[PDB]
């Protein structure tokens, strides 16, 4: 259980001088989602490939998800699963070793949950509350919904940030109205953990490497988990 961050543990948007659009892009109504699927291929040992087609546009029919190591991949390799995460295209690589070089491809990290046993009845959705703090005062709270009993932290993070882009301009094209932000998860068993919401300093943003934190395929219990988003303004 990691200590909460101090202001020196946190990326400042004011030190990022590239395009904050490339961070907004990963969160702004952007996700791969699939229900009741099974992996069809592998590229490297720690990854799995699924046949999932893009809904919104037609940017992909194949998705590769990378996990921590080969053991984690073997756990899920033959399993019927659901998928939810944030995908990227720059530096996304994988042989389809069939050529099939004419098929759209996309990549992501973790996002995998066993399907059987993980769903509610008759289309019911579990709410998860997100409380937001700006400059160390509660401002608003909102709910996000998921269809999973055990849900990746990644799915919830994406839903939380999507809402905040639209409600709070969390990320804009050029910069952010916030200087720092982290999203903090609190499990009923007392375990906490957090993700920095701001890009590393400098004039470039590496989407793949930012998303790689979802590597661990970390799941929380939707019924009981708590979430806080902590922001300071510019």
């Amino acid at each position: 259980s990691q200590p909460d961050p101090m202001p020196d543990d946190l990326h400042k948007s004011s030190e990022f001088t590239g395009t904050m659009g490339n961070m907004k892009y990963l969160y702004d109504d952007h996700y791969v989602s699939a229900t009741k699927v099974k992996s069809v291929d592998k590229f490297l040992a720690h990854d799995l490939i699924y046949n999932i087609s893009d809904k919104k546009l037609k940017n992909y029919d194949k998705v590769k998800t990378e996990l921590l190591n080969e053991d984690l991949a073997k756990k899920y390799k033959d399993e019927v699963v659901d998928v939810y995460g944030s995908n990227y295209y720059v530096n996304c690589y994988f042989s389809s070793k069939d050529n099939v070089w004419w098929h759209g491809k996309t990549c992501m990290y973790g996002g995998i949950t066993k399907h059987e046993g993980n769903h509610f009845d008759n289309g019911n959705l579990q709410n998860v509350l997100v409380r937001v703090y700006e400059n160390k005062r509660n401002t608003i709270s909102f709910e996000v919904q998921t269809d999973k009993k055990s849900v990746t932290a990644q799915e919830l993070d994406i839903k939380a940030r999507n809402f905040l882009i639209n409600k709070k301009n969390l990320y804009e094209f050029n910069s952010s109205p916030y200087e720092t932000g982290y999203i903090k998860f609190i499990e009923n068993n007392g375990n906490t953990f957090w993700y920095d919401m701001m890009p590393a300093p400098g004039d470039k943003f590496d989407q793949s490497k930012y998303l790689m934190m979802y590597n661990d395929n970390k799941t929380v219990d939707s019924k009981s988990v708590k979430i806080e988003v902590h922001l300071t303004t510019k």
């Binding site: 590239g18 490339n22 720059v90 989407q207």
Partner: protein, 109 residues
């Protein structure tokens, strides 16, 4: 055609939001938006290394950009100014080869 720009000629008024679109057929990773003005070569505004990516060029100020698909790269003047009057050229490229569109002439009145 490798590269197509839409529209080819446009009139706008100060403060209008103007979007210029460019479609390529080559599935190149890289796309570019430039403006051509007197006393300058083509100056790079934003470019893109692939879907979901855009990067500022030498004169990004008072423009945004969007790369929603391999084929599409848009340039967005979010509140147009007389100085944004220009001829704008989209390119796709691979290695040292650039494939230009025919140009879009924009008057901001």
């Amino acid at each position: 055609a490798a590269v197509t720009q839409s529209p080819r000629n446009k009139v706008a008024v100060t403060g209008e939001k103007v979007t210029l679109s460019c479609q390529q057929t080559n599935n190149h990773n890289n796309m570019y938006w430039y403006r051509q003005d007197t006393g300058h070569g083509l100056r790079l505004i934003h470019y893109s290394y692939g879907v979901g990516n855009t990067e500022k060029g030498d004169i990004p100020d008072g423009y945004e950009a969007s790369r929603p698909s391999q084929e599409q790269f848009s340039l967005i003047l979010v509140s147009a100014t007389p100085s944004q009057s220009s001829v704008y050229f989209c390119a796709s490229g691979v290695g040292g080869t650039l494939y230009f569109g025919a140009g879009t002439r924009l008057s901001v009145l």
